[PDB]
Amino acid sequence: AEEVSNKQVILKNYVTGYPKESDMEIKNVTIKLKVPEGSNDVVVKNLYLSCDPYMRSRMRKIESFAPGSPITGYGVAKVLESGDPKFQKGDLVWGMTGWEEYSIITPLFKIHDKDVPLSYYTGILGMPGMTAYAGFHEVCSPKKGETVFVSAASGAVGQLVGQFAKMLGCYVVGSAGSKEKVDLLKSKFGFDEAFNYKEEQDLSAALKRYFPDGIDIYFENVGGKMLDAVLVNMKLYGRIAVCGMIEGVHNLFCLITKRIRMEGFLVFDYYHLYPKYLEMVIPQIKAGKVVYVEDVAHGLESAPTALVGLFSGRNIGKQVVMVSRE
Amino acid sequence: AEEVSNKQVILKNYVTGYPKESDMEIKNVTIKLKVPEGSNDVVVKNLYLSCDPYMRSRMRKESFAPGSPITGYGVAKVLESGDPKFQKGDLVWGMTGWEEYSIITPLFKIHDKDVPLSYYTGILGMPGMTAYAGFHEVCSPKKGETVFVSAASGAVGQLVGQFAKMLGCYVVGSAGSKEKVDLLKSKFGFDEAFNYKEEQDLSAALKRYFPDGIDIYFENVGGKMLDAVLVNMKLYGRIAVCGMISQYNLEQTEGVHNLFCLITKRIRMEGFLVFDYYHLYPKYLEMVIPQIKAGKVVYVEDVAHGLESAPTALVGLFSGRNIGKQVVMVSRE
């Protein structure tokens, strides 16, 4: 069997406050590229690793990461060997993998379309795209002409939700944390309006300015004070898809008077709809009708920085790490 | 037209904290029992008035007006009508004034008086329709699911528990006294119940009653109770947000902290108002009335007598003096 050096990003310890580079280290080991006898494991060479916000919670003790082992997360990989009938040497796959050059994956999606850049299978064609589609299309049951608000709108998820809303004929407003993200939202992603929540003294007032007749749909990435501001601005029968949250919420009585449906979901419950997502979004990508922006960090050695950078909000759009070229 | 003296319960001032009896007064006016010449109004004699917790909010600056009668749901007899739908002698229920006689702009006609008329302020009126629409529709309940009902001895929660039981759900209720807890289990057939005041830790109390979590929360209370439920919900759990009674007498609301559970447990938490479900009211009556007459569905109300008791009845409600649904009888007829 092939035996190769394997660079890994190890969680050195659980993190309490500011996740920092020094909470991870690079370890170099030797791996044999062989399906373990008996198993239906898959042996892969990792090509891209996604840096996704949910991973931060996994660095603290609560399934969390383990000190001493590689970080894991969504990625794109090429199969080298397989004990699973459905994958063969040479297949391209996306799903959960290790933060390392080669992983052994236990019981993952096969990639069929390679006309698109492979990096997209960490964003629009991967979990963030499926998340936006599940929350917006499935949970909010949106209708043409409805008004839509997205918090953390410059994120991997939010930027898609906004474009999907536009594609449907909705009026769409986004919230973000810098001048440059706000301009990106309007100038690159086609949000009708956007605002820097940091510059507003009164979030409810600011939502009222952009939604004079109220909000039909909130794509919730934030919670707390932002949610309170959304609640008093919702239209009757308004819908809130609770995707992510980052202060006590005081305005829940608005759920009654406005008859709001507020509903949490997890993307992995909707993966049986992924083919039907690919059929909607792939042509849009081709017709240049849905755009995507991303920061690409190069090499595993840059991965600790990239991850801390994402957690920090120090980057524009989706953060990814390219593990190797080709 | 007949002209009669008309006692009225007037809101004297907007209310700060818990209402007191002195926030209201009895006034006596002369009323002409006549349909205003242009209108399709109905002239009614009021027989029963409901005391409902949502009224407490209407007492602060839709809101009630200082100097004017309190208004709310009641049961009344038609004396004169400018509306072909309603005839002299009809019994109706709907919004009316806290007074002996009201002029209403059309309101449900009552057909069955083989039940107590007071029932049309509760089990057969708005609270019963709320329990029905909230549990039967909003909660999408299934046999064998676990159900928690806050303010369970209240007018709405006491029905929710019995509906859940009829479906074969396992049902637990919270109330604010030993007497109300005993009632939930002995009369309303809740599987368990507890006095919220006697629990050091609501989250741990709910874990004890629901080892595997709560499928359905019928929410009447809000606040720390909701936070304790959130951490105890099952996967794809549902919360019908009906009322938040713990919140109505506060200058500012309490912060809810556990909404991250909506994500982890994929909960649907949905507000609703009975106004949107009155299309199901004929279905609800035709189901519930046979059950009432068979003693398969039970109700507990308190009936205070005379308009002069209404302030005390209303204040009492807001502070838990009543067992079950509070009503005021204005008159017999």
Q: What angle do CA A176, A181, A184 make, to 5 degrees?
A: 125
> Which residues of B lie inside 8 Å of A (Cβ-Cβ)?
222, 226, 241-244, 247, 252-257, 259-273, 276
Angstrom distance (rounded) from CA B62 to CA B84: 28
Residues with Cβ within 8 Å of residue B185, at least 6 apart in sequence? B191, B192, B193
Residue A155: which of A306, A297, A267, A317 has the closest Cα? A317
Question: Measured between CB atoms, which of B244, B252, B266 is closest to A264?
Answer: B266
* Closest-CA distance of chain B to residue A260, Å: 5
Angstrom distance (rounded) from CA A104 to CA B38: 84
DSSP string, B283-296: HHHHHHHHHHHTTS
Residues with Cβ within 8 Å of residue B33, at least 6 apart in sequence? B1, B2, B3, B4, B43, B79, B80, B101
Give the containing element (helix H, strand E) for A263: strand A261-264
Angstrom distance (rounded) from CA A45 to CA A165: 36
Helical residues (DSSP H) of chain B, grouped into ranges: 126-132, 157-167, 178-186, 202-209, 224-230, 261-264, 281-293, 310-318
HSE, CB side, 13 Å, CA atoms: give it for residue A278.
17
Angstrom distance (rounded) from CA A84 to CA A32: 18
Angstrom distance (rounded) from CA A110 to CA A93: 4
From residue A72, alpha-carbon distances to A32, A84, B209 in Å are 19, 21, 37
Which chain A residues have a beta carbon less than 8 Å from that of B259?
Answer: 223, 227, 242, 245, 249
Which chain A residues have a beta carbon less than 8 Å from that of B276?
Answer: 259
Residue B187: which of B99, B295, B82 has the closest Cα? B295
The two counts, helices (H) then strands (E), for chain B are 8, 15
Phi then psi for residue A166, to 5 deg, are -60, -50
From start to end of B69-139, where are the E strands? 71-81, 91-97, 101-104, 108-110
Angstrom distance (rounded) from CA B203 to CA B194: 13
Domains, chain B, ordered by start? 1-122+300-333 (3.90.180.10), 123-299 (3.40.50.720)
Which chain A residues have a beta carbon less than 8 Å from that of B258?
Answer: none
Phi then psi for residue A139, to 5 deg, are -80, -35
Residue B210: which of B171, B165, B238, B241 has the closest Cα? B171
Residue B180 near residue B111, CB atoms below 8 Å: no
Residue A94: which of A126, A117, A65 has the closest Cα? A126
Q: What angle do CA A316, B266, A257 make, to 5 degrees?
A: 95
Angstrom distance (rounded) from CA B153 to CA A1: 71
Query: What type of residue sits at position A134?
Result: A
- DSSP, collapsed to helix, strand or coil, labels residue A197 as helix
Which chain A residues have a beta carbon less than 8 Å from that of B273?
Answer: 256-257, 259
Angstrom distance (rounded) from CA A222 to CA A133: 18
B238, closest residue in chain A (CA to CA): A263
Residue B122 near residue B299, CB atoms below 8 Å: yes
Query: What's the token pair of residue A106?
Result: 């236990």
Residue B21: which of B296, B218, B278, B308 has the closest Cα? B308
Provide the β-strand partners of residue B198.
Answer: none
**Most A CBs within 10 Å, among B256, B265, B274, to test the A interface:** B256
Q: What's A99's DSSP letter?
A: S
Residues with Cβ within 8 Å of residue B302, at least 6 apart in sequence? B313, B322, B323, B324, B325, B326, B327
Instruction: Tell me: is residue B180 an annotated ligand-binding position.
Output: yes
Angstrom distance (rounded) from CA B107 to CA B99: 17
Residue B154 near residue B128, CB atoms below 8 Å: no
* Closest-CA distance of chain B to residue A163, Å: 23
Residues with Cβ within 8 Å of residue A174, at least 6 apart in sequence? A149, A150, A151, A153, A154, A158, A162, A182, A185, A189, A191, A193, A194, A195
Instruction: Tell me: is residue B160 an annotated ligand-binding position.
Output: no
Q: What angle do CA B317, B196, B134 make, to 5 degrees?
A: 65
Angstrom distance (rounded) from CA B182 to CA B204: 21
Angstrom distance (rounded) from CA A310 to CA B41: 65
Residue B274 near residue B126, CB atoms below 8 Å: yes
Q: Enter the resolution in angstroms.
A: 2.0
Region for B223 from its dihedrals, namely left if φ exceeds 0, alpha if ψ lies in -120 to 50, beta otherwise: left
> Which residues of A lie inside 8 Å of B (Cβ-Cβ)?
223, 227, 242-245, 247-266, 269
Residues with Cβ within 8 Å of residue A39, at least 6 apart in sequence? A83, A106
